[PDB]
Amino acid sequence: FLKVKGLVKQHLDSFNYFVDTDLKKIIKANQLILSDVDPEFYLKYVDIRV
Amino acid sequence: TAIQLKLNPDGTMAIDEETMVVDRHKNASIENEYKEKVDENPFANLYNYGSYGRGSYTDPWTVEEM
RNA sequence: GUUGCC
DNA sequence: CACTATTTTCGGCTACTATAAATAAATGTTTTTTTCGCAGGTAACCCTTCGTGGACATTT
DNA sequence: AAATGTCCACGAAGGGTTACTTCGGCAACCGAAAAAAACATTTATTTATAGTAGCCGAAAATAGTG
C-alpha cells in the first residue's frame, strides 16, 4: 500500500490534479474578454499548459 | 434596427422588451466569422528599420508617360 | 512590528 | 549534348534617413490650477417604556 | 355634597451598550474633469553625403530535364 501510494499522498496528488485537469476548467469560465468601444475585437483562450 | 412590437390576444399593442435594447456585437460577429483564418508562424512577423515608416515603392516611369 | 517553539 | 528553367546577383533606381535656417499656421500632447461626485466571552449600566398610583376637577 | 373622570410622576422591568480575559525566554523578520497654457511637430524648400532597405529585374549562370 505504501510502495505505489507513498507518504506525501495528500500533498502531491492534489497539485497533480491541479496542473493537468483543473486549469482547463478555469479558462473556460473567464473566456472572451470584450471591449465595448470598437466592438469587433475579442481575445479568447483555447487551452492552457504548464 | 428600429424597435419592434407585436399584437398578443392577451395584451394587444405590446412592445418587445428585448428589442428595446441592442446587443452591438451580433452584427460585428457575422463578418468576423466570415474572415479568413491563418496560423501565425512566429518567424513571419520579423521587422527591421524599414518598418512603420511612411513611404512606399514608386512604380518606375515609362516613355509613354514622358 | 508579526509568527513559530521550549 | 543542348536549349531551356529558375535562380543567383548585381544594379540602378528610389525613398527616406540628421544638418542648419526662415515662418505662419495648424495641430497634438501634456502640468497647473479652480472645482462638486445623488436618491431621485462576561458583566455593570445606563436607557427606555411600561405600569401604577398620585390629587385636581367637575359633575350629580 | 362626593364620586367619578382625569391627569401626573416615580419606580419596575428589561432594553441594548461598552472594557474584559498568564510568565517567562529563544528564533526570527518588515476622486475626477474641464479649462488654461505651453510648446513640439508637421507643414514646405533647399542642398549638399552613406547607409538601409525595399522592390524590382533583367540578365548572368549554372543547372534540370530530353
Curated annotation (Swiss-Prot), chain A:
Subcellular location: Nucleus
Note: Present with 1950 molecules/cell in log phase SD medium.
Function of the protein: DNA-dependent RNA polymerase catalyzes the transcription of DNA into RNA using the four ribonucleoside triphosphates as substrates. Second largest core component of RNA polymerase III which synthesizes small RNAs, such as 5S rRNA and tRNAs. Proposed to contribute to the polymerase catalytic activity and forms the polymerase active center together with the largest subunit. Pol III is composed of mobile elements and RPC2 is part of the core element with the central large cleft and probably a clamp element that moves to open and close the cleft.
Subunit structure: Component of the RNA polymerase III (Pol III) complex consisting of 17 subunits.
Family to which this protein belongs: Belongs to the RNA polymerase beta chain family.
Protein name: DNA-directed RNA polymerase III subunit RPC2
Species: Saccharomyces cerevisiae (strain ATCC 204508 / S288c) (Baker's yeast)
Parent-protein residues present: 51 to 100 of 1149
Swiss-Prot record, chain B:
Subcellular locations according to the entry: Nucleus
Domain of life: Eukaryota
Stated family: Belongs to the TFC5 family.
Function: General activator of RNA polymerase III transcription.
Assembly and interaction partners: TFIIIB comprises the TATA-binding protein (TBP), the B-related factor (BRF) and the B'' component (BDP1). Interacts with TFC4.
Name listed for the protein in its UniProt record: Transcription factor TFIIIB component B''
The species this protein was found in: Saccharomyces cerevisiae (strain ATCC 204508 / S288c)
Residues shown, of full length: 360 to 425 of 594
